[PDB]
Amino acid sequence: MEVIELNKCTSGQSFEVILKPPDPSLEEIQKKLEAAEERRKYQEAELLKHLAE
Amino acid sequence: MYTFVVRDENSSVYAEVSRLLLATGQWKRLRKDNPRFNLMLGERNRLPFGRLGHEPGLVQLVNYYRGADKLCRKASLVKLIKTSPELSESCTWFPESYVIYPGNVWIAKSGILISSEAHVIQKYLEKPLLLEPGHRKFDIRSWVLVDHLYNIYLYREGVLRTSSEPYNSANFQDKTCHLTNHCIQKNYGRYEEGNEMFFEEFNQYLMDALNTTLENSILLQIKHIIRSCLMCIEPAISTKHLHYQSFQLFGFDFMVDEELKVWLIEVNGAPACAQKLYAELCQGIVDVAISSVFPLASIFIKLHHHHHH
Amino acid sequence: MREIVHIQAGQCGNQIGAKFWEVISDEHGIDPTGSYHGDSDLQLERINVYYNEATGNKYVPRAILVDLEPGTMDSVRSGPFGQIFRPDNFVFGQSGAGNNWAKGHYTEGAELVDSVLDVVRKESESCDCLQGFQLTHSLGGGTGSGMGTLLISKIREEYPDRIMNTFSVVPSPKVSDTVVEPYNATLSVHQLVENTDETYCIDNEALYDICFRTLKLTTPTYGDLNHLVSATMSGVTTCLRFPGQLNADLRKLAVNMVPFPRLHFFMPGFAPLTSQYRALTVPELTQQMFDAKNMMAACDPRHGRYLTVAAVFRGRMSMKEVDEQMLNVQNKNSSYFVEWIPNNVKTAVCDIPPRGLKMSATFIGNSTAIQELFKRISEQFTAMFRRKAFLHWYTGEGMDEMEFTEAESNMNDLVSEYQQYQDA
Amino acid sequence: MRECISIHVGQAGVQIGNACWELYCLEHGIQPDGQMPSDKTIGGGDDSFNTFFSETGAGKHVPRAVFVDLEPTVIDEVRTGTYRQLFHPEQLITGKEDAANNYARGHYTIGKEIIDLVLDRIRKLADQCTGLQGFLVFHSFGGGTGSGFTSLLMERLSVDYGKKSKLEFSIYPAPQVSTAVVEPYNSILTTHTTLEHSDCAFMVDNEAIYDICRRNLDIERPTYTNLNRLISQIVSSITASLRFDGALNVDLTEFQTNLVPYPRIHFPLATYAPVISAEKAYHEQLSVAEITNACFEPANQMVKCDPRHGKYMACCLLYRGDVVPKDVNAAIATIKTKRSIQFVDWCPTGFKVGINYQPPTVVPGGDLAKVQRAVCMLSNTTAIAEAWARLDHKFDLMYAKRAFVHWYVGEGMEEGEFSEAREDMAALEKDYEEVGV
Ligand SMILES: Nc1nc2c(ncn2[C@@H]2O[C@H](COP(=O)(O)OP(=O)(O)OP(=O)(O)O)[C@@H](O)[C@H]2O)c(=O)[nH]1
Ligand SMILES: Nc1ncnc2c1ncn2[C@@H]1O[C@H](COP(=O)(O)OP(=O)(O)CP(=O)(O)O)[C@@H](O)[C@H]1O
Ligand SMILES: Nc1nc2c(ncn2[C@@H]2O[C@H](COP(=O)(O)OP(=O)(O)O)[C@@H](O)[C@H]2O)c(=O)[nH]1
Ligand SMILES: CCOc1ccc(-c2cn(C)nc2-c2cc(OC)c(OC)c(OC)c2)cc1
Ligand SMILES: [Ca+2]
Ligand SMILES: [Ca+2]
Ligand SMILES: [Mg+2]
Ligand SMILES: [Mg+2]
């Protein structure tokens, strides 16, 4: 069991111990935020058409 | 009034435990996909251990130990024996087995090949014990119930799955004398019923013929191997301090050689009981494994041995 | 989202509505003239849900009173808590609705509906953030049934993204004004399926049986039926009206209770049933609120399955023991809750109890058994409709037989739709 | 040093933020108004604690924090609370209308209107940074804001700030604490959309925290205050290395490197001991070996799973208090012989240790007792795949019937995003199983 890379300081210390070895764009986003607003606005239009009938 | 689910239809043991549970008044079965159970009697393949012990309010138990496949798959059982210290590579009761992937006689398995030419390759016990009158091979099946506390309970009644043909050294191809399973046979029940000899009779034969007992000559080594095997895997599988709990019924298959030495052939995680013993065993599983966790309104022998060294 | 606007339509609507305001004003320490004379800060902390604050720190209900005849709304003004309602919000016609849907929806009510919506707008405009609307009405008569469902359609047109609740007194021959009720109810149900997010089915059959059998009232008035309703109405609205931490709004309830949009017909329950000295243990409240005897919609919940449940325990009690008890009935009767919606029972606790009782429990269930109520009204409808009986009253107001055949069919689909998930 | 911005989305994030910053203040000796006597360089400095707080000429120490809820009631308690003066009001952002437990309402509808405001207020903090590292994002998996707005923000952060690290602190939903029925949808939908935009993600199952509070603090019915105060001690363990002088996990890139070799599998298990009651009259203080050994008990993990059945890719012990390297390695050797600590073949079978001598700080009058030494193990183990299996199974039950789906579609979302997002998770469960078996 080997205890390597030991580093010390006044507040603490650290080491490793080894037992054994071995994104879309601004356009694409703003697009399909607005595509969700289309279908939202289509449903509301369908309703207000149905309510007119 | 507790609740259970049955997700293994094929299990003849836990068909009977279901039947014994229902017929009481305090155990309603549910649909297999209901999450709100006290007891799962789960499937063999892909038992969803990750889903257990999460439903709030309910204490959840299951009839399998997760990771105990590492004792019942042959290929894993061989690796466990060669790799672990507690059962070392110098293990005096396991047949000398080897693994290469797909007296010098061997056997292969995971069609059964007994030869010198040619999964796991295992040393073949050339000179086994033979019952008289018969001149015939057998294997011993002992049923073992590990509960939620990891108490190892050995069922007193075992069974000798007998061969009925005389054994032969020169002839290997013929499977009716060498392989002593229940299905390969079906002289199917010439000497005893369905090729089975229960422990009272096998004790009497050893008393009369060999001037000893089953308890001393054979059962001491069975008790050693069972306890050796299960306590090795305990850290890997124990459900102590776990959000669900596990019991399991195991079936250990042994072979007694000519100089009264016991050998471990195979362990079975989903074992079928003998036709006579179902009622008494399955009752015992409800007593010890289920009712001990879920109380209502000894057939087993306990294998504990803390020798101080 | 804090403000709810309340509307009450017709005789039954205004009658149960009055009692709802009497009950909750008492729980908030608001006296008959509108002044606060309580004690706790918890009475005032969510008072803005149902009340506007006026000049001289008076609290006036956010309540609009609607009827096509002056009878009932005159009684409300004369009645005990009449002086609290804003007088501008009394909107009434004179000619009446004759227990006729057509009059309420198409002719007499059409004349008055715009003047009602002006007051609705007046109360909405001065809402910091309007969350939704609730309507008390009956489906058996003319005004509450016909005009009520018309106002619901108008309110949806103008406020299409707000929540629309109803407390809808479903009719029954045991407590019947007129033979035409099943017609009125069936025409209204079709409306409610489209234009409400939640509809609390108060069945008069149930309220009678509860008054008769389980309260020992031999000859029950409408007053005795309305006590049960105004208690239930206080119960479901507790978590909106009081704090807190686990606090609530209408939209989250509507979302979690309604798996499919047409299936939003709930089955209320209350415990214990009153008109007492021994307070109930938590296991009893749990047993009682889930009992068929305590249900306000006359359906046996064993004949279907719960899609969702919501339970509101009131009083100072062990929240450990509530959880334990709610988990008991779920784990002991799991066949009556759908497996395919996990964790479909939500419980809340509220420390303030109602007047009289030290601890109560209100129950809201979206069960598939509610189909039975619609099957009952669908049978009553067809007995008459198959002989076109009493249709002249409606066809005289311009209605067609086609409109009846539609509304029949829509409600028979609703019953099919509820039956679909009772088997799955 | 390099600066770090914490972002708290929804009720879960905000209220957990309050727990964290209250603790961070007590740890550094900063007070409710924001004055820090121990700070000598007034109005500036490049100390380790300045990675989380910024300074003003008046001597106030101000969090690098942004609170975001789509409804005001929760953030109002911050504005009127004990640490009201601590935050600049531009950091506390609110709407008028919540996402109603709906991923689509928070992401698509209400998200769209408020995203540009939030990113602007984040850029106000980024331009007080001489070299920004990245972001610590706090949210729920189950809320509409928490699930919905978070995924939109995490996308728009990768655009505007592409060279930075993004860490998640996620509250996996549990029936014991309050729950909506639709949270398994919200969780899967946001995990899918956030997966490529988060670098390391620390999940915390409320079921685990709840039971830890029941079992170890003897609290019958735990409040959020109880749950959050415990979660913040865990969070503080993890972030302390960024806030204090040290040599392990000194930047946000080092968490990724030490804990996340496979990038989709960026969900490490946090295990934390000891949790001890302040009401406990007589307490025998636990040693280095006892607390390290506790990091392999399931009962102390943030997510209930069985690390025995599954393999490790990375392990990190983060000690706090009276600890020395030789007591640690002694415990590590003991623990190797008793427990099934199976690593993957390609990774080394090791432990990156980090010690800070200042023992755990605790909130006055709180549930947790002061202790001489504590630890937080961070282990990228495949057993945490259990948490996905559970969530996906609930998802499959409701979605088989299209239950509640109309609510999401009604906010402009497409039903295809459900099956798309679930198919990613199906791939994620398969990515875990190859590595683990
Ligand atoms: N640990 C913890 N969990 C919380 C807290 N508040 C809410 N939750 C959990 O988060 C989920 C609900 O998410 P919330 O954060 O309340 O939702 P939100 O982000 O406000 O979303 P909307 O209210 O829909 O806008 C549930 O699983 C709750 O148990 C908290 O303070 N601490
Ligand atoms: N090394 C060996 N020496 C002698 N006989 C052996 C042997 N290995 C296997 N056998 C014999 O082969 C037969 C079947 O093999 P084995 O017991 O390994 O598999 P199995 O699957 O049939 C047992 P079960 O199904 O009950 O779990 C047994 O009857 C046994 O006697
Ligand atoms: N529960 C209850 N039901 C009522 C009351 N008044 C009328 N009803 C019922 O409502 C239906 C008649 O509706 P009603 O309100 O009189 O007609 P409207 O004034 O035109 O709406 C019948 O089914 C009655 O049984 C009441 O005070 N309480
Ligand atoms: C089937 C699950 O039903 C639920 C779950 C949760 C909620 C809910 C969420 N919030 C934020 N508030 C509520 C809620 C719960 C209630 O039941 C106790 C209410 O009483 C009826 C309530 O009043 C509006 C809100 C709802 C249903
Ligand atoms: Ca007229
Ligand atoms: Ca400084
Ligand atoms: Mg009348
Ligand atoms: Mg919110």
Coordinates of C-alpha atoms in Angstrom, one line a residue, chain B residues 33 46 49-51 53-56 66-68 70 79 234-244, chain D residues 175-176 205 207 214 297-299 304-306 308-310 338-340 342 386 389-390 393-394 397 433:
Chain B
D33 CA -46.7 -5.8 -10.3
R46 CA -33.4 -10.4 -13.2
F49 CA -33.5 -6.0 -5.9
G50 CA -33.0 -2.2 -6.5
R51 CA -36.8 -1.7 -6.2
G53 CA -37.0 -1.6 0.7
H54 CA -38.2 1.8 -0.6
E55 CA -42.0 1.8 -0.1
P56 CA -42.5 3.7 3.2
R66 CA -28.5 -10.8 -4.1
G67 CA -25.1 -11.9 -5.2
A68 CA -25.6 -15.6 -4.2
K70 CA -21.6 -16.4 -7.2
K79 CA -13.5 -18.8 -9.3
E234 CA -21.6 -13.4 3.9
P235 CA -19.8 -10.0 3.7
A236 CA -20.8 -9.9 0.0
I237 CA -24.5 -10.7 0.4
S238 CA -25.7 -10.2 4.1
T239 CA -28.8 -8.0 4.4
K240 CA -27.8 -6.8 7.9
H241 CA -28.2 -3.0 8.2
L242 CA -29.9 -3.0 4.7
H243 CA -33.1 -1.2 3.6
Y244 CA -34.7 -4.6 2.7
Chain D
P175 CA -42.6 9.8 -1.1
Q176 CA -41.7 10.3 2.6
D205 CA -32.4 11.2 -2.2
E207 CA -35.7 9.2 1.5
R214 CA -35.2 9.6 11.9
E297 CA -22.6 1.3 5.4
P298 CA -25.7 1.9 3.1
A299 CA -27.5 3.6 6.0
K304 CA -29.9 4.1 -0.8
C305 CA -28.2 1.5 -2.9
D306 CA -25.8 -1.4 -2.4
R308 CA -21.2 -4.2 -3.1
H309 CA -23.1 -5.1 -6.2
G310 CA -21.5 -2.6 -8.6
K338 CA -13.8 -6.9 5.5
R339 CA -15.8 -5.3 2.7
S340 CA -16.5 -6.0 -1.0
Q342 CA -14.6 -4.0 -6.3
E386 CA -30.6 1.7 -8.7
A389 CA -34.2 2.0 -12.3
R390 CA -36.7 3.1 -9.6
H393 CA -40.1 2.2 -13.5
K394 CA -42.5 4.8 -12.0
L397 CA -46.2 2.9 -15.3
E433 CA -24.5 -1.9 -16.6

